């Protein structure tokens, strides 16, 4: 039956799923791995004319 959150949703399942979070602020590794630049590079170049 047509007849619950017609078109107008709960705020409560919005304000349940902010309630969880799943913040990151600086724990948020997820924003540096993004940069591929090779952090775990042994670069052990001779010297430093490249």
């Known amino acids: 039956m047509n007849f619950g959150a ?3 949703n709960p705020a409560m399942m919005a304000a ?3 309630a969880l ?3 990151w ?3 948020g590794m997820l924003a540096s791995q993004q940069n591929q630049s090779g952090p775990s590079g042994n670069n052990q170049n001779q010297g430093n004319m490249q």
């Open 6 to 8: 017609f078109s107008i």
């Open 16 to 18: 349940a799923q902010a």
């Open 21 to 23: 979070q799943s913040s």
């Open 25 to 27: 602020d600086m724990m």
